[PDB]
Write a protein that binds this ligand. Structure first.
Ligand code: A1IW9
Ligand code: ZN
Length: 109
């Protein structure tokens, strides 16, 4: 009854992005802490599915945090906030989203 932790929205604008139900335990955990080559740390949650994003450019394998996957930058389709990455080109699953947990807001359906 009345769950308050069902939907993830863009923290900056409220755009609908994903659901707790769609969390994906990649390598046995949904949470992955990673750094980019600029040394920025991200707490990434893996989702099987997401919506309301805009995927920018073509995939790159360069410095992929997930073995066998190529990444594309995922912006909030509404406000342009960088919310994470779409991963593709791999196996089991072929694709998923790695979203930056602190750039989302969790709340009711
Ligand atoms: O899996 C990923 C996705 C983002 C990616 O960041 C950059 C990669 C190359 C150059 C600049 C940033 C990364 O390090 N790993
Ligand atoms: Zn947004």
């Amino acid at each position: 009854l009345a769950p308050g932790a069902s939907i993830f929205r863009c923290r900056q604008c409220g755009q609908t992005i994903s659901r707790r139900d769609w969390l994906l335990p990649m390598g046995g955990d949904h949470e992955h802490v990673v750094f980019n080559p600029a040394g920025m740390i991200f707490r990434v949650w893996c989702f099987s599915l997401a919506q309301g994003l805009r995927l920018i450019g073509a995939p790159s394998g360069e410095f992929s945090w997930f073995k066998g996957y190529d990444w594309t930058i995922a912006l909030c389709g509404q406000c342009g906030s960088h919310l994470g990455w779409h991963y593709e080109g791999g196996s089991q699953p072929q694709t998923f989203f790695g979203l930056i947990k602190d750039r989302l807001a969790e709340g009711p359906a």
